[PDB]
């Protein structure tokens, strides 16, 4: 990943083994849960496409998820090539040729060319584009790992309200259908599926009730 | 405080002059950042090497379609289109830089430089900047356009960037 | 987070992966203890709102608590907008940006805008404001995670005074109240709920005795 | 709908309540039948898209059919957009812009814009295009509401030829097919499905016998 | 309601009796159904606030719904007064003062003032604002008159798919919680509550199936 | 009535037969409901006292109500003549004389005096006073016609809450008390007279009881 110097300029730097070790360990230990996308975006800030291909190829196991991510990256690269055709002929001396989708992916280009793209004037953010594509792929992967659907949630007679709302919001963050649909769901489905006693305790507070009073009602 | 960007204009490759723009980022900030960033090319894509595809003498010069090069395309740094930020500033005279659109909340990257007072456009196109240096370069450009907009020679943004 | 760089010019330095790993580990190992608030405040010194958003997204589990935190951040932003609306006044000769409830919460504010608001003279304390909001949310969360009320703390028949006062002060620190309420409670509730064998000992010492005197009295 | 006003200047005249009541009555008694498409085309002559939206909203019940109509209108709008692209840019002061695919359905087009598109020279046939779309939708709906197929129409043992041919032609008109296919369908199905005695009576007349001779054969 | 003349200007016109008669008949005969709002919006185009107060007071019976509408109008009027505060100082010569939240309803203003407000330069659309408020109130009324919730829909073993989808879309248009949530519901809840045989027939077409093939699958 | 010609004088126009036909139809079919007063005020707009006398005389049957209405008109005319002195003697040309109570009733004048009084500068509206008197009389009639009082409404054990609130609000519309007393009763006796189950439900609802909340609570 590129790093700025004392005078402000930046140059390529070898990827730290600690970053790779932490990434592989968090992938192994935390599997594929909603909290891998923020950590992935934090680990590889400013990483070249070669570094991202490293961080993806290094993930042993869960090869189906990695194949899904590869297919998503392939579709995004095809759409990028369709929306931005590259020109042919001689290239200007002060400009380097613009990358194609397969080259934005970093599959058929050298590291020096990535560094030249990233430190050009004006700079070309190939790393950020490929990171956005990988984040979309990881969103689709965490959508696939979702164990249950949002509608099938029903609290058991003994399962506490805390565990119920924990499971609900876990699969809700794993759903990621939309934002306003999520807002409507947390109003309706959250109170629609409570245990009868605590259910009517929550209905006593009306729809204006917030989550804090919703929990301290059934609390104790 | 308010950014200033320039355009080195070219007519079929012969250099013609530099137009520089003050972007009113203190009133239309999101509109001004999108023109600034597309001029520097810092987000990967932009105005450098795009042309003015529609120049109507006594009205305005329009350009900025860097994807389709004919007024049907262009994209913003926020996605392909975004909202009309506001309408504080009005089309008061030549040199005003205003956003082209395909109706409300459809701003992308096309802009037009007015060469006359066009009050009928008020309330319908966001104004976000004005020519600082170079208005006679904008005026000379008019001669290469027509009543319907078609230009006679290719007029390009040979280079562009930020000055301040 | 931004940091003073040689010489005297603050530049943006992205959050280090080791800090994120330390935060994930402390949230995994210690759950939601009263001490996490200081660990969080010390791990994110001078952090841009984007860094705090990253540190709140990298959490694994406890999605209900994160939802209360987000809702309290929204409430603080709403109140902040209400307490800081633009009243008509003559325009200032010098213009500096301004942070909205949504500009403070790092939702719609780009990293460059936050760097500007922080490094500009005079500085806009967006980082400290967002940290105060997150600290209020974490106080709410740790006061919710309290298993039992402070009023229910009672010593066992043979439970030593050591563990009794330890658990009592832990629950009291987790509990929320003004300092004078705590000053009254440590004098009215501590000695009363003790075991009678050592309760007589504490009564023999006196009502206004300090903690160390009672502790060495019932020692052994 | 706009109407020629004395003298020679079309002005906007809002839809009359009596027309809406007639439409509600015909969609209350006739419900969905082949005759509704012709009645609808006559009640809404030269109607602005807002008037057609008003006439489609006033229908009470049959929400599935209205949803089919809305979805087919959306499909036709998408096809019109794919066939007639709309170029972006400032409009000319004298002429109006080319309407997009959704400006026809009156969703985002104000009444003034439609009045302009209709009264301008040359006129833009937005009303007739939206009427063609609604007519396609109504054809879909009336072909769906058919209780039985045309192949299932068979005459009863003592059911007179009158009711048989009436029901057969009604189902054939409700059915959707090219007129060229119907020319073979009638000569293949009308005589075959009749009663055996009337079957021989019609076959005695000949294969290419007209409808009136075939009728007067088994008359009474 | 105002009406345009040959010269182009508009002036007040007495409300037609067979409009009041039609409105009272449609309100009583159809009671409250989703198709009363389009009829109301079509009947009173350009009506003054006095005409709308007439059309509301004239509705005999269902006084609870009319009181709900009055309360909704009441709250809406208060919000308008709070959002915009009258300016102080000298007033321009070519301009005169505006109405209040309660006067938008027309409760404490004469008809001539309404006509002056509607035909001023520039015109002030008090009629359209009060019509929007009444339409919102009628939406809440038709929400209350919904006989079930959206989740309780489960098709019976014998109830045909046509009746099931009709009931579903009826109570869905009567729900009006949102538009994208409606789009998610029509994908999930529509496919989740079918009868097992036709359920797996619909599952044979996958989620890409449209409504037309969805119904013609279970058809016949 | 008095139709205002478009850009012209307010020409007098005899009452159309449609108005009288609708009036006799409603007074025959609907007897004397609370809403008839709004429909009467709607049909007769800007009408001369001759028009109102024609609309009242055309009523067939219920002669006791007509005699009470005439007695109320006589009482109002006597009060008007008592609290307003009537001038006499020679009257200056171009200025009509003082309208008398028996004259403002239209029983001792022709159409010319009424048209002159409704066209003077400043205008002296005889129609808006005679209609006010007729509305007072019709209010007395509809109060007399009410079968049950407001204080004696009790909900049946099986009769649901909707029918109870319908009857309650109908009788309230028929009530004669002032508006503040009306608010008091519609605030208290509504929940104070319901069935015990939903009575306790609404008591659990507590203060600030609003009609839609009440009806959503008493569901099922």
H helix intervals, chain F: 17-29, 36-43, 49-57, 63-82, 101-104, 111-117, 127-145, 161-173, 179-192, 196-205, 211-217
DSSP-assigned letter for residue D11: E
**Cβ contact B121–D86 (<8 Å):** no
Our answer to whether residue B54 is catalytic in this structure is yes
**Cβ contact E7–F3 (<8 Å):** no
Q: What is the 3-state secondary structure (H, E, C) of F170-185?
A: HHHHCCCCCHHHHHHH
Q: Give contacts of A 145-164 with C, CB under 8 A.
A: 162
Shortest distance, CA D179 to any CA of chain E (angstroms): 23
Inform me whether the C-beta atom of residue D98 falls under 8 Å from chain B C-beta atoms. no
Q: Do chains D and F touch (3 or more CB pairs under 8 A)?
A: no
Select the residue of C21, C54, C63 nearest A173 (Cβ to Cβ).
C63
Select the residue from A149, A172, A176, A177 to test the E interface by mutation, using most E Cβ atoms within 10 A.
A177
CA distance from start to end of chain A = 52
Q: What three-state secondary structure class fits A134? A: helix
Shortest distance, CA A72 to any CA of chain B (angstroms): 20
Whether the ω angle into residue B141 lies within 30 degrees of 0, i.e. cis, is: no
Our answer to whether residue B110 is catalytic in this structure is no
Contact (CB, 8 A) for C104 and C77 = yes
**C-alpha closest to that of A111 among A100, A127, A128:** A127
Resolution in A: 6.1
**C-alpha closest to that of B137 among B3, B31, B19:** B19
Helix, strand, coil: what percent of chain B each, to 5? Answer: 15, 35, 55
Inform me whether the C-beta atom of residue A88 falls under 8 Å from chain B C-beta atoms. no
Our answer to whether residue B59 is catalytic in this structure is yes
Shortest distance, CA C203 to any CA of chain A (angstroms): 33
Q: How far is CA A64 from CA A76, A144, A171, D78, in A?
A: 18, 11, 21, 36
Contact (CB, 8 A) for B47 and B66 = yes
Q: Which residue of B has its CA nearest to D95?
A: B148
Select the residue from A4, A22, A37, A38 to test the C interface by mutation, using most C Cβ atoms within 10 A.
A38
Catalytic residue, chosen from B7, B52, B59, B144, is B59
Burial of E161 from C-beta contacts in 10 A (0-12 / 13-18 / 19+): buried
DSSP for F52-75? HHHHHHT--S-HHHHHHHHHHHHH
- Reading the block at residue B95, the tokens are 């040199």
DSSP-assigned letter for residue B11: E
**C-alpha closest to that of C211 among C153, C165, C147, C146:** C165
| Neighboring chain A residues of B161 at a CB cutoff of 8 Å | 122
Method of determination used here: cryo-EM
Select the residue of A6, A35, A165 nearest C58 (Cβ to Cβ).
A35
**Cβ contact F33–E58 (<8 Å):** no
Shortest distance, CA B68 to any CA of chain D (angstroms): 11
- CA F155/CA F165 separation, integer angstroms: 9
Catalytic residue, chosen from B6, B35, B112, B144, is B112
| Neighboring chain A residues of B162 at a CB cutoff of 8 Å | none
Helix E211-218 to helix E196-203 angle, to the nearest 10 degrees?
Answer: 140
Catalytic residue, chosen from B121, B147, B162, B163, is B121
**Cβ contact B42–A122 (<8 Å):** yes
Which subunits sit against F, judged by 3+ Cβ pairs under 8 A? Answer: E
Our answer to whether residue B45 is catalytic in this structure is no
Phi, psi at B55, each rounded to 5°: -125, 115
All structural domains of chain B, each given as residue ranges with its CATH number in brackets, are 1-164 (2.40.100.10)
- CA E47/CA E23 separation, integer angstroms: 13
Our answer to whether residue B121 is catalytic in this structure is yes
Inform me whether the C-beta atom of residue A22 falls under 8 Å from chain C C-beta atoms. yes
Q: How many residues does chain A have?
A: 220
**Cβ contact E212–D24 (<8 Å):** no
**C-alpha closest to that of F198 among F176, F167, F184, F219:** F219
How remote is the C-alpha of F13 from its chain's centroid? 24
Contact (CB, 8 A) for A217 and A198 = yes
Q: Do chains D and B touch (3 or more CB pairs under 8 A)?
A: yes
| Neighboring chain A residues of E182 at a CB cutoff of 8 Å | none
Contact (CB, 8 A) for E1 and E13 = yes
b/e map F12-40, b = 16+ CB within 10 Å: eeebeeebeebbeebbeeeebbbbbbbbb
Q: What three-state secondary structure class fits B133? A: strand
Q: What is the number of alpha carbons within 13 Å of residue A43 lying toward its C-beta?
A: 27
Place of tokens 């109870």: F164
| Neighboring chain E residues of D61 at a CB cutoff of 8 Å | 35, 166, 170
Shortest distance, CA B129 to any CA of chain D (angstroms): 18
Q: Which residue of E has its CA nearest to F33?
A: E60
| Neighboring chain D residues of B101 at a CB cutoff of 8 Å | 88
**Cβ contact D87–B100 (<8 Å):** no
**Cβ contact A169–C62 (<8 Å):** no
Which residues, in sequence order, are bridge partners of residue F129?
none
Phi, psi at C88, each rounded to 5°: -60, 130
């Amino acid at each position: 990943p590129i790093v700025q110097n004392i005078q402000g300029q930046m140059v390529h730097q070898a990827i730290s083994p600690r970053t790779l070790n932490a990434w592989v360990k968090v992938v192994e230990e935390k599997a594929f849960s909603p909290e891998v996308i923020p950590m992935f975006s934090a680990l590889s800030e400013g990483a070249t496409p070669q570094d991202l291909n490293t961080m993806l190829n290094t993930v042993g196991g869960h090869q189906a998820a990695m194949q899904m991510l590869k297919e998503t990256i392939n579709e995004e690269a095809a759409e990028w090539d369709r929306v931005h055709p590259v020109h042919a002929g001689p290239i200007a001396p002060g400009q380097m040729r613009e990358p194609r989708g397969s080259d934005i992916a970093g599959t058929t280009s050298t590291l020096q060319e990535q560094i030249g793209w990233m430190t050009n004037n004006p700079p070309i953010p190939v790393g950020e584009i490929y990171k956005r594509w990988i984040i979309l792929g990881l969103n689709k992967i965490v959508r696939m790992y979702s164990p249950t659907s949002i509608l099938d949630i029903r609290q058991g007679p003994k399962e506490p309200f805390r565990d119920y709302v924990d499971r609900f919001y876990k699969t809700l963050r794993a759903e990621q259908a939309s934002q306003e649909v999520k807002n409507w769901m947390t109003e309706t489905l959250l109170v629609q599926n409570a245990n009868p006693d605590c259910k009517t305790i929550l209905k006593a507070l009306g729809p204006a009730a917030t989550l804090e009073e919703m929990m301290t009602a059934c609390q104790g | 405080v308010n950014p200033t960007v320039f355009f080195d204009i070219a007519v079929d490759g012969e250099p013609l002059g530099r137009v520089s723009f003050e972007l009113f980022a203190d009133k239309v900030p999101k509109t001004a950042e999108n023109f600034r960033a597309l001029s520097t090319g810092e987000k990967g894509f932009g105005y450098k090497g795009s042309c003015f595809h529609r120049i109507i003498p006594g009205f305005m010069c329009q350009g900025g379609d860097f994807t389709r090069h004919n007024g049907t395309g262009g994209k913003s740094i926020y996605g392909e289109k975004f909202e009309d930020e506001n309408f504080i500033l009005k089309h008061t005279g030549p040199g005003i830089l205003s956003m082209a659109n395909a109706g409300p909340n459809t701003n992308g990257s096309q802009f037009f430089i007015c060469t006359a007072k066009t009050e009928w456009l008020d309330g319908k196109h966001v104004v976000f900047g004005k020519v600082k240096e170079g208005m006679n370069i904008v005026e000379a450009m008019e001669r290469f356009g027509s009543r319907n907009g078609k230009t006679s020679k290719k007029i390009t943004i040979a280079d562009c960037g930020q000055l301040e």
